[PDB]
Design a protein around this ligand. Structure first.
Ligand SMILES: *[C@@H]1O[C@H](CO)[C@@H](O[C@@H]2O[C@H](CO)[C@@H](O[C@@H]3O[C@H](CO)[C@@H](O)[C@H](O[C@H]4O[C@H](CO)[C@@H](O)[C@H](O)[C@@H]4O[C@H]4O[C@H](CO)[C@@H](O)[C@H](O)[C@@H]4O)[C@@H]3O)[C@H](O)[C@H]2NC(C)=O)[C@H](O)[C@H]1NC(C)=O
Ligand SMILES: *[C@@H]1O[C@H](CO)[C@@H](O[C@@H]2O[C@H](CO)[C@@H](O[C@@H]3O[C@H](CO)[C@@H](O)[C@H](O[C@H]4O[C@H](CO)[C@@H](O)[C@H](O)[C@@H]4O[C@H]4O[C@H](CO)[C@@H](O)[C@H](O)[C@@H]4O)[C@@H]3O)[C@H](O)[C@H]2NC(C)=O)[C@H](O)[C@H]1NC(C)=O
Ligand SMILES: C[N+](C)(C)CCCCCCCCCC[N+](C)(C)C
Ligand SMILES: C[N+](C)(C)CCCCCCCCCC[N+](C)(C)C
Ligand SMILES: *[C@@H]1O[C@H](CO)[C@@H](O)[C@H](O)[C@H]1NC(C)=O
Ligand SMILES: *[C@@H]1O[C@H](CO)[C@@H](O)[C@H](O)[C@H]1NC(C)=O
Ligand SMILES: *[C@@H]1O[C@H](CO)[C@@H](O)[C@H](O)[C@H]1NC(C)=O
Ligand SMILES: *[C@@H]1O[C@H](CO)[C@@H](O)[C@H](O)[C@H]1NC(C)=O
Lengths: 532, 532
């Protein structure tokens, strides 16, 4: 049988699924770990005890316990990102989409979802791997990992809540793929991890982390990098937040044993209810429980590992969207709303930069303001709006990724860099939000191929180009076809620093993506804040 | 007789001088003070003892003792600014050009020359007032004042070298004009002081200084303002430099009496030889002996006088040239030379900003660099050259003047602001130096009217417009004619901040002259340097 696969964990039964008037195989909700429940909340994942009999892998698994956006009830723009399954701590499952007939050993792509380490699901409509598996003849895996306090509460020194266990969840999925993907026709020697947002940051963390490096060949990072300021905290900051969480649930704080015991007695939703009370600043684009720089998962600080070349040397492909900031302003910054142009007064501008750069003294705020204000206009509400949008994207996504790119590229074996700036013609969010954080994903997964979803034809063509770049890169470490009359996406080099626009127009090649601003965010501002 | 004028100081005999195939009267080298010689070196000026008999005012007087540029021997571009008369400490004279026939009471314009308070002469070809007096039917005066150590050595606490005596020289000329210009057909109730560079700074100092305010009605400032960083020093900095000068001449430093006595025994050229040894930094656009903020001439700091409105409220007209910096880079910054394009390497750029901002810590230098570097190019020698040129002009001239304009305008009775950006077609300096510091002067004095000097016709027309703006403004406090089909030069207001380009093209009205950069130089950088 073709839906029956025998693995090292036991036999698995999949389903036949329709895709663009053809079929492929799908193995949904395969467990790669023991359920992290009861005593095991906050602990490292345990490998899944082998089972006898056949595991029914015909439906999606549960999603991990998490915050649910309810700002816009029924609005597909927001709800497309919420859990579409029952939430459970019992959530360590992966899903595999396999071509029909089954290949012998093809390229494998493992998807790691985003959501700021506080949210995310492998089971979302946008993450359905069937279009990509079918179109590009690859085995598509999507894993899951604990998020929020459940995956990132960090009481360093303890084994009951060591920190980073959500990242270890990911690694265990990768270990499982390494060990068992051969039985699905996957090539374990050619597996590409890819993710967006925190998933992109996670991908870069697996590049850095010595314990993860041997488990994949290549990586793609979308709008995310390990050195992003929201992506990690120190062990002491993690400890403060752990304690502060316990303070919010009236827990005993005499010791780590008594704190963790108390946090384990709580129902999951009780923790989720107070998750945002623990942030030490009034901020946006900052999340309560994220990876810690612990000494185990990362031997030293992220920056010295990048400087010294302490990372997996391979090929990477990565990029960013035009308007990464706009989501976080909508949700957390005064003046912005879903149903207006959101012209921003001078006061909401100043309020906005405070929120965007929370550790900045007054001089730091003046420096940002000077950098992003048009002083010819100055009071124009659109320019304030757009300036603020650029501040949030540049600081949190574009400029950290550019720092990573420039430092990876000195020691790596190939970088390809993209800037995705197509506004989808069927987008539900207002025009002011531009090319939004997360909306290249639908092109990478081929949703513009399905007629019922109301994309344009030139959008179908863009998605096909993107799926082909991604898959070819997974396959060979180059997104380009050997022959191909189409224009080459060139390597990003230290010297020339070339990247491409990813849009419906014929490919233009640019240089030095946002250098003026990234010299400000990566060199000048830190030096300024350190000297004060 | 028409060349014979009887004044309160005694009778004066002038000469008939030819001007554009007509005649006017000229009274050259009239003394307004006692010669500051011997015991009187460094002392306040004494009023000129009345003389009997007729003072021959038929030839230019001597120039004040001063540094002589010899970088380019025989080069008219440099030598047009050197003394064209014998140098002498006996130099306190003024020159008066009067229309023929003599008027009864017309507008008076008093010219105060520049030269960084270390140089300058009333007698230069470019400062010949006859063209302006004739064309605009005004009485033109040019005064002189001691420069260098002779006019600005400042041992505060002493009466033998109080400081600022060069500024008092100027005031005594103004007092003399107030008292005696009526006898030349001048209206003492309508006298406009105007100057360029340090003369423009001097004009603004007379606006500020309570003892000078009553002696003129209106002011014009060209490429200079009192709050420029090169235009003044504190009493302690003046004292250090005085002592350091004495140290260079092996003088006794036990006391002020013994130091000043020793500096008086020196021949003038001995002081001039070591004048530049006393600057405490490696800098450009900084001069050794300049006005001191003493408490007498200026009751408090320049900035608090501007903030509190402690100044003469009247009409001012002022402006700047496109490329104020280029002279000072040519003379003092590595990479620049008269006979090349002067493309600047990255090293000469960094060397150049150090020189330009001498009190700046490393963070301050990074801030300037960030502000003026195109990071798309970065290594382009032309862009480095032009960036550096803009740094020197903006920091030393444009942005200080804009601060003055914005602060004067809150309390004043009319501001008119210009940006002069015509490169003269007969200019002798290289193209890279652009519209040079001091080269609007030739238009203000009407040299483009003389055929032999090789200007274009549209340059004659520009000079006629400029002489007319200047004279009309002197006359009424508005550079515009009541009727006139030509476009109005609007008032500079706090709200709209309008100014005009002064060039051969039809008048364009702009707003907010160089605000982006002036927010950097006037707000951000000081705050940055104070916080560190
Ligand atoms: C592809 O493009 C097409 C065309 O642009 C899109 O099709 C449109 O889809 C919308 C809905 O998604 C549809 O609008 C509905 O029309 C119905 C009939 O006129 C209405 O009954 C319905 O109103 C209800 O829902 C609204 C919330 O959106 C409420 O404002 C309203 O009060 C109604 O709410 C009712 O809900 C409950 C439960 O059903 C009921 O008990 C009550 O009566 C209550 O009142 C919508 O307005 C458009 O008409 C569609 N247009 C066309 C031409 O088909 C399509 O969505 C696109 N596809 C994708 C995937 O994007
Ligand atoms: C208006 O425009 C016109 C046209 O552009 C300008 O007229 C030109 O003016 C220059 C001089 O200013 C003149 O050049 C001279 O030509 C002479 C005859 O050919 C030369 O003898 C003279 O050379 C001497 O001076 C040079 C320094 O500039 C030296 O390089 C050279 O070695 C010579 O030096 C001599 O000097 C001493 C003392 O005299 C002598 O003992 C030695 O022999 C020694 O050798 C110049 O090259 C041009 O020819 C003029 N052109 C025309 C067409 O007339 C005019 O200047 C402009 N007017 C203004 C006000 O700007
Ligand atoms: C592409 N994804 C799925 C990754 C991220 C965008 C999903 C919408 C949420 C963005 C707004 C931030 C909300 C901040 N929190 C809830 C803390 C307020
Ligand atoms: C328009 N004027 C007459 C006012 C000023 C320009 C005159 C040429 C001198 C500029 C170069 C500065 C030299 C610096 N010092 C000699 C100190 C080196
Ligand atoms: C697997 O589960 C589905 C739905 O829950 C069910 O319909 C199907 O019968 C199951 N498969 C097997 C082989 O029992
Ligand atoms: C990557 O590695 C291969 C094989 O070691 C080498 O020959 C090739 O030049 C490298 N390419 C890049 C872009 O570094
Ligand atoms: C004034 O001086 C000039 C030149 O020095 C001389 O030629 C002239 O005769 C003098 N005038 C009188 C009235 O003596
Ligand atoms: C200046 O002063 C006059 C008379 O006091 C006044 O009426 C006029 O409006 C003022 N103009 C400006 C520009 O301030």
């Amino acid at each position: 049988s073709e839906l029956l696969v025998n693995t090292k964990s036991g036999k698995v039964m999949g389903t036949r699924v329709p895709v663009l008037s053809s079929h492929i195989s799908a193995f949904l909700g395969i467990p790669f770990a023991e359920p992290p429940v009861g005593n095991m909340r906050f602990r490292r994942p345990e490998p899944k005890k082998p089972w006898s009999g056949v595991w029914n892998a015909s439906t999606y698994p549960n999603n991990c316990q998490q915050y649910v956006d309810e700002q816009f009830p029924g609005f597909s723009g927001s709800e497309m990102w919420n859990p579409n399954r029952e939430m459970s701590e019992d959530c360590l499952y992966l899903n595999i989409w396999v071509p029909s007939p089954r290949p012998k050993s093809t390229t494998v792509m493992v998807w790691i979802y985003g959501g700021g380490f506080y949210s995310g699901s492998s089971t979302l409509d946008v993450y359905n791997g069937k279009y990509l598996a079918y179109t590009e003849e690859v085995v598509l895996v999507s894993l899951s990992y604990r998020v929020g306090a459940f995956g990132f509460l960090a009481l360093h020194g303890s084994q009951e809540a060591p920190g980073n266990v959500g990242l270890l969840d990911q690694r265990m999925a990768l270990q499982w793929v390494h060990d068992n993907i051969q039985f699905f026709g996957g090539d374990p020697k050619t597996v590409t991890i890819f993710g967006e947002s925190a998933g992109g940051a996670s991908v870069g963390m697996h590049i850095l982390s010595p314990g993860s490096r041997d488990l994949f060949r290549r990586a793609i990072l979308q709008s995310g990098s390990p050195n992003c300021p929201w992506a990690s905290v120190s062990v002491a900051e993690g400890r403060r937040r752990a304690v502060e969480l316990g303070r919010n649930l009236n827990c005993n704080l005499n010791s780590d044993e008594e704190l963790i015991h108390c946090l384990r007695e709580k129902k999951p939703q009780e923790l989720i209810d107070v998750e945002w009370n623990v942030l030490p600043f009034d901020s946006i684009f900052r999340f309560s429980f994220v990876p810690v720089i612990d000494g185990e998962f990362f031997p030293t600080s992220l920056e010295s590992m990048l400087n010294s070349g302490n990372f997996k040397k391979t090929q990477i492909l990565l990029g960013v969207n035009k308007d990464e900031g706009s989501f976080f302003l909508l949700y957390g910054a005064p003046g912005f709303s879903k149903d207006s142009e959101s012209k921003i007064s001078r006061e909401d501008f100043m309020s906005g930069v405070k929120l965007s750069v929370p550790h900045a003294n007054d001089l730091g705020l003046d420096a940002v303001t000077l950098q992003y204000t048009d002083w010819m206009d100055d009071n124009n509400g659109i320019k304030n709006r757009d300036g603020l949008d650029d501040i949030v994207g540049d600081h949190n996504v574009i400029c950290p990724l550019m720092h990573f790119v420039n430092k990876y590229t000195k020691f790596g074996n190939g970088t390809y860099l993209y800037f995705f700036n197509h506004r989808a013609s069927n987008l539900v969010w207002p025009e002011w939000m531009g090319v939004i954080h997360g909306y290249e994903i639908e092109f990478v997964f081929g949703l513009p191929l399905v007629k019922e979803l109301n994309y344009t034809a030139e959008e179908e063509a863009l998605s096909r180009r993107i799926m082909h770049y991604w898959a070819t890169f997974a396959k060979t470490g180059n997104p380009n076809e050997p022959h191909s009359q189409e224009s080459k996406w060139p390597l990003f080099t230290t010297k020339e620093q070339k990247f491409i626009d990813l849009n419906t127009e014929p490919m233009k090649v640019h240089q030095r993506l946002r250098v003026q601003m990234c010299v400000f965010w990566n060199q000048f501002l830190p030096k300024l804040l350190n000297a004060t």
